[PDB]
PDB file of C-alpha atoms in Angstrom:
ATOM      1  CA  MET A   1      28.589  20.230  45.222  1.00  0.00           C
ATOM      2  CA  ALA A   2      26.944  19.246  41.950  1.00  0.00           C
ATOM      3  CA  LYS A   3      24.481  16.468  42.680  1.00  0.00           C
ATOM      4  CA  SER A   4      21.925  14.692  40.492  1.00  0.00           C
ATOM      5  CA  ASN A   5      19.173  17.166  41.352  1.00  0.00           C
ATOM      6  CA  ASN A   6      20.045  18.101  44.930  1.00  0.00           C
ATOM      7  CA  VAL A   7      20.164  21.878  44.991  1.00  0.00           C
ATOM      8  CA  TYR A   8      21.141  24.457  47.583  1.00  0.00           C
ATOM      9  CA  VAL A   9      20.168  27.996  48.465  1.00  0.00           C
ATOM     10  CA  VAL A  10      22.800  30.732  48.493  1.00  0.00           C
ATOM     11  CA  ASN A  11      22.378  31.589  52.187  1.00  0.00           C
ATOM     12  CA  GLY A  12      18.670  32.231  51.675  1.00  0.00           C
ATOM     13  CA  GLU A  13      18.878  33.748  48.193  1.00  0.00           C
ATOM     14  CA  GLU A  14      19.381  32.057  44.813  1.00  0.00           C
ATOM     15  CA  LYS A  15      19.265  28.287  44.217  1.00  0.00           C
ATOM     16  CA  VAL A  16      22.302  26.584  42.722  1.00  0.00           C
ATOM     17  CA  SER A  17      23.197  22.902  42.420  1.00  0.00           C
ATOM     18  CA  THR A  18      26.749  23.516  43.734  1.00  0.00           C
ATOM     19  CA  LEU A  19      28.124  24.738  47.082  1.00  0.00           C
ATOM     20  CA  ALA A  20      30.443  27.161  45.274  1.00  0.00           C
ATOM     21  CA  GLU A  21      27.328  29.341  45.362  1.00  0.00           C
ATOM     22  CA  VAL A  22      27.409  29.704  49.159  1.00  0.00           C
ATOM     23  CA  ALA A  23      31.180  30.158  49.143  1.00  0.00           C
ATOM     24  CA  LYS A  24      30.483  33.598  47.678  1.00  0.00           C
ATOM     25  CA  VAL A  25      28.394  34.689  50.665  1.00  0.00           C
ATOM     26  CA  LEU A  26      30.531  32.796  53.169  1.00  0.00           C
ATOM     27  CA  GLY A  27      33.518  34.828  51.995  1.00  0.00           C
ATOM     28  CA  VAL A  28      35.444  31.646  51.383  1.00  0.00           C
ATOM     29  CA  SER A  29      37.273  30.259  48.349  1.00  0.00           C
ATOM     30  CA  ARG A  30      35.683  26.968  47.338  1.00  0.00           C
ATOM     31  CA  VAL A  31      33.597  25.662  50.210  1.00  0.00           C
ATOM     32  CA  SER A  32      32.102  22.475  48.883  1.00  0.00           C
ATOM     33  CA  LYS A  33      30.962  18.996  49.986  1.00  0.00           C
ATOM     34  CA  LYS A  34      33.017  19.311  53.176  1.00  0.00           C
ATOM     35  CA  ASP A  35      30.417  21.843  54.318  1.00  0.00           C
ATOM     36  CA  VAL A  36      27.734  19.184  53.965  1.00  0.00           C
ATOM     37  CA  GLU A  37      29.800  16.362  55.464  1.00  0.00           C
ATOM     38  CA  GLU A  38      31.574  18.336  58.199  1.00  0.00           C
ATOM     39  CA  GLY A  39      28.693  20.729  58.798  1.00  0.00           C
ATOM     40  CA  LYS A  40      30.591  23.964  58.223  1.00  0.00           C
ATOM     41  CA  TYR A  41      27.779  26.453  57.742  1.00  0.00           C
ATOM     42  CA  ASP A  42      23.985  26.393  57.743  1.00  0.00           C
ATOM     43  CA  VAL A  43      23.443  25.480  54.121  1.00  0.00           C
ATOM     44  CA  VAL A  44      20.292  23.684  53.036  1.00  0.00           C
ATOM     45  CA  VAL A  45      20.343  20.684  50.694  1.00  0.00           C
ATOM     46  CA  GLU A  46      17.134  19.604  48.953  1.00  0.00           C
ATOM     47  CA  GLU A  47      16.145  18.411  45.492  1.00  0.00           C
ATOM     48  CA  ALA A  48      15.210  21.597  43.586  1.00  0.00           C
ATOM     49  CA  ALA A  49      13.194  23.459  46.244  1.00  0.00           C
ATOM     50  CA  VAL A  50      15.258  24.077  49.366  1.00  0.00           C
ATOM     51  CA  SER A  51      15.376  26.472  52.354  1.00  0.00           C
ATOM     52  CA  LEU A  52      13.225  24.063  54.365  1.00  0.00           C
ATOM     53  CA  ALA A  53      14.954  20.684  54.635  1.00  0.00           C
ATOM     54  CA  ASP A  54      18.755  20.378  54.840  1.00  0.00           C
ATOM     55  CA  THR A  55      19.077  16.668  54.132  1.00  0.00           C
TER      56      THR A  55
END
């Protein structure tokens, strides 16, 4: 994940401001900021409108 206004896309679906969203699709428990920092999966991070950035 919950950032100021940095939001993600649930593997190309819904937009949520917390990586717990993708964890649903990724079949994982609570994949969070480690995904962003370690680069686990191809999740996109952008303020509000994502799916074309991944900051």
